[PDB]
Design a protein around this nucleic acid. Sequence first.
RNA 1: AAAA
Length: 614
Amino acid sequence: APVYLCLLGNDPAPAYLGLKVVEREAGRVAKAVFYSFPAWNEEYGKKRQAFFRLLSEKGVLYEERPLEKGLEEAEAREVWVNLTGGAKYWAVRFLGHWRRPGARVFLVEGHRALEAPRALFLWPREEERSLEAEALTLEEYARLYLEPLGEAWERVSPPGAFPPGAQAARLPGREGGVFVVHRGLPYWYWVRPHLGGEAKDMSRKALSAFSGEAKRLGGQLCLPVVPYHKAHLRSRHPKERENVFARWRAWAREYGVFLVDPGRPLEEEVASLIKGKASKKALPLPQEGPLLLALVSEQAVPLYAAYLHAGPREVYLLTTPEMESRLRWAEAFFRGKGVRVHRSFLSGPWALREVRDLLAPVVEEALRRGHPVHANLNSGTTAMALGLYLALRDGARAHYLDGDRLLLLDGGEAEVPWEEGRPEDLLALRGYRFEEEYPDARPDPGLLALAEEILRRWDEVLVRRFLKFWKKRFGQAFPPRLKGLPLEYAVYSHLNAHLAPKGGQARMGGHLVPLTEVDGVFFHRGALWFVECKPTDEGLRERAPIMAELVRSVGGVEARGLMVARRWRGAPPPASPNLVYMALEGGEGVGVYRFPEELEKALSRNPAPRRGLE
RNA sequence: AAAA
């Protein structure tokens, strides 16, 4: 009987799907071996145990092994190797090793909305097939995702907006959504069934929370589908209607929600997102090195790291039509840095062979002409990244950012010149213009004393003497809203003293304008941080839910939020995996760190960015 | 991490 060899990351669903594929084609497996990465949080840990429970019910013996142990000869005559799981770095390394007799190597690719996942066989023959039959059912998702999270559920009729064949469940403990499984993929679909729910305005708070909720319930590719409240729009003045709708659209883009017309089938809404983009031409051959080749996808930091490392004169960017906005912002970023940009669209996220065929000639020409060729392997789907790897030839320089350092695919690590990074550049790459409120503010000992003076005497009606020294030292005047400025300047000053020595960059507050307000921002070693400054723990508690989603969506997976109070009083801060809570005074012995004395301690309790592959 |  065949043996299943499988990279295992946070989500058990692609691992399970790959097992169903093997079982359908080859029958009962002798055993499964999982090369597992540590689960990123307790919920994923629980989902993984649910997966192992399912394997046990399936009569499938399994074991977990370190990744390196997967780079050895097979014991069984026939192995099926699934490379979808975990970091694409390991897919690349396993693909090198497992292209051998006695092995079938494949991926499962489910990143196009409303399609069934595909199997891409890479070895011994390139083949692709639709996984309509093997697609996970609602019940399979319930036992892998919902049961381990303690979510009760019951089957309900699916929303009419889905194509035929969808299955759905209501979660009585989770108001406001329906969990829909369609052709093997999960969707968290917004419903407001209570009378006049659809006639109310939609909030930034509810939209952001819905996106986080979708990701907790259904994982990384669970699409939050939100039919907008057209009845509310019809209740508006025509001008206000345009304003309201624009706000919803902006919020939905910001938190990763798929905002849809309730009057249309989802198939049409998805088609509109991908329509009219087909690229016709090959990529122009390179004229000037160095070159950077990269995919474009949700995380901007790896692409930015690649830019800092490679210092390219030409960049080649490939992605899918559904990532058109991100591609547009990446192109603008690189053009703004004087880099020649070439871009093309793939037919879809499965298009490994398109990436390979688009890039092979560019690589070959570059190597002929002696242009250094850098290839970043962080972005796109595993299919896309493997496509890029397969375009490479001896001499190419492939890397993968692992938190704060680049892993070199042929061995060794590159330290990134992070000291050359700027938070405003990262944000541009991501799709935002950071409009600073205090661009010329810099650290100044005397102005800091004043600010700190004010902070001791916060019982308020000196503030005029602060604003006057601000005018003097920075040339900035204000017309007769600045109450938060003393805390913001103090926080910025101590951040800057802590970070500058170490190559980090700190900034004061302003507006994140899509191409939301913050009290500060800093970038250090592959993690962006947004800062929120409040008089009390009370302002921070109220801000935390939205801040956590802003940090995640706009800052990225390794981003964090620094929450600083002048005075901490109440209970310990609420559980926040991506926020850090500090205070000038108070909160000793309730988890809250002391600012600025315990900065080092606070920023390294859970180091950002995380290294996954040490 | 199923598009670090």
